[PDB]
């Protein structure tokens, strides 16, 4: 529904889809050569179908070709400060592909807008749709534009004759978060047969180790998934298949 | 709150019509034959 969508949203009003309780093989993201940019920072792209996280959010939008380099932790710029701010400790990935053949009219596609005037930098993962007239000067702007009162949004000129730097690029970002809640979205990772009372390599919701699993009697609460010790090591584990 | 290295004060007297000709990139008799201001003028002008 994201990649094969007929239309997208603006820069500041990016589309945010939260995903929960699904599988992703991630193999389609590697063989597809249509992606012009594919930068994974928090987690390596090769080791993606073997980890697992709690939740994931996909933020998709369409920007200019020159702004594609602005989606990076610590990067500054117009879009990076007034349209979409990325945290420094961002654990996720970014994909981007050129679509000048689709999102460009014969005379110019002006349906895409971007925020260029704002008196403060945006917060990480913040969405602002404030259409209030920006006050560039010292005179008050009481809903009237003109001198020292300009519109906070500006339209993109998407023509098929523009250079590669001024071409429309569809950019999606995947942000992963891992909490003590049961991990929902990750690769398929078919469950192996459960074996008890043997020194084996165990793997539970990404937590990998070596040990012997035995029956227990500790009554864990329904929201308690993992149990830690004084040395921050795992002592008891709840089977993600059966209680 | 910014304090610089050196100051240059150019003082003169012009006509009432030449008051508009004191600016970077101005055209006129005074701005071309008497006193011309550079395009990258870093300063200020006070006329009374």
């Amino acid at each position, epitope marked *: 529904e994201v990649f094969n969508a007929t239309r997208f949203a603006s820069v500041y009003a990016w589309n945010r889809k939260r995903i929960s309780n699904c599988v992703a093989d991630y193999s389609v993201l590697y063989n597809s050569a249509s992606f012009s940019t594919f930068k994974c920072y928090g987690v390596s792209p090769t080791k993606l179908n073997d980890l697992c996280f709690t939740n994931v959010y996909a933020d998709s939008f369409v920007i200019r070709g020159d702004e594609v380099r602005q989606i990076a932790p610590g990067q500054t710029g117009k879009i990076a400060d007034y349209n979409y701010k990325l945290p420094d400790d961002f654990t996720g990935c970014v994909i981007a592909w050129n679509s000048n053949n689709l999102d460009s009219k014969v005379g110019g596609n*002006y349906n895409y*807008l971007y925020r260029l005037f704002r008196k403060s930098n945006l917060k990480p993962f913040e969405r602002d749709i404030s259409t209030e007239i920006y006050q560039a000067g010292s005179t008050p702007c009481n809903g009237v534009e003109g*001198f*020292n009162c300009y519109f906070p949004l500006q*339209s993109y000129g998407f023509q098929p004759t523009n250079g590669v730097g001024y071409q429309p690029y569809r950019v999606v970002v995947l942000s992963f978060e891992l909490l003590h809640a049961p991990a929902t979205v990750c690769g398929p990772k078919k469950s192996t047969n459960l074996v008890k009372n043997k020194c084996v390599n165990f793997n539970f919701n990404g937590l990998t180790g070596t040990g012997v699993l035995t029956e227990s009697n500790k009554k864990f609460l329904p929201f308690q998934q993992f149990g830690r010790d004084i040395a921050d090591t795992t002592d008891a584990v709840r089977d993600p298949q059966t209680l | 709150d910014l304090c610089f290295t050196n100051v240059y004060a150019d003082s003169f007297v012009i006509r*009432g019509d030449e008051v508009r000709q004191i600016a970077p990139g*101005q055209t006129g008799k005074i701005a071309d034959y008497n006193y011309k201001l550079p395009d990258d003028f870093t300063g200020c002008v006070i006329a009374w």
Partner: antibody, heavy 128, light 108 residues
């Protein structure tokens, strides 16, 4: 090459309304405050309003404030002007006006400068 | 709302000038002056921007000035082609970039 085609001539009855079309191309359409400037036959030229295809923002003359409704469709990149409650001195040739710069001249006074690309002609003959 | 001559007469090669007075609020307070030239059956063509600055392509013979509330367009070396109307304007506080009575320049 900024090309600008204005709609055809019109005859109207007074007190009615007239709508003139204004189709632009050859440039970044939405990046301009486009004005609408009129002129009675053999008279002086008379400005009426302007519009931003971006954000739909516009501003009219107080003389026209109330009788003029200016719209635009950026998809076909075409601005439109309407004048209701027509009368005799409204008989005139009207044009739009594409502006010189872009209002990315943050304080480049845009768009309080000019109309560089003017339109052919629209003759409104308001005669009973 | 500005006041320029309706018609000015000059000879070829002569330096003629057409003024237009606004108010202390429009001309006397803003270097946002405008000078257009229009030929019969033709669209208005900008000649002078910002009081004395010439847009790209405009011939140097057109010079701009302003004193208090009156702007001035000086055409040195009048030519036969210099026959046209001139329309000055000044920002008026709102809307917007209109003009004077318009002056037809004739070259005897």
């Amino acid at each position: 090459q900024v090309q600008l085609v204005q709609s055809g001539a019109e005859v109207k009855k007074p007190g009615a309304s007239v709508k003139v079309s204004c189709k632009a191309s050859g440039y970044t359409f939405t990046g301009y405050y486009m004005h609408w400037v009129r002129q009675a036959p053999g008279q002086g030229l008379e400005w009426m309003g302007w519009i931003s295809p971006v954000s739909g923002g516009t501003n009219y003359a107080q003389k026209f404030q109330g009788r003029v409704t200016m719209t635009r469709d950026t998809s076909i990149s075409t601005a439109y002007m309407e004048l209701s409650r027509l009368r005799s001195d409204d008989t005139a040739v009207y044009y739009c006006a594409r502006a010189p710069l872009f209002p990315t001249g943050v304080l480049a006074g845009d768009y309080y400068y000019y109309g560089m690309d003017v339109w052919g002609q629209g003759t409104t003959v308001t005669v009973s | 709302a500005l006041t320029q001559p309706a018609s000015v007469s000059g000879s070829p090669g002569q330096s003629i000038t057409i003024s237009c007075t606004g108010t202390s609020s429009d001309v006397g307070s803003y270097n946002l002056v405008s000078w257009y030239q229009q030929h019969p059956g033709k669209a208005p063509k900008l000649m002078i921007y910002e009081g004395s600055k010439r847009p790209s392509g405009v011939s140097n013979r057109f010079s701009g000035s302003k004193s208090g509330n009156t702007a001035s367009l000086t055409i040195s070396g009048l030519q036969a082609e210099d026959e046209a109307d001139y329309y000055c304007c000044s920002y008026a506080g709102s809307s917007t970039l209109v003009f004077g009575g318009g002056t037809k320049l004739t070259v005897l």
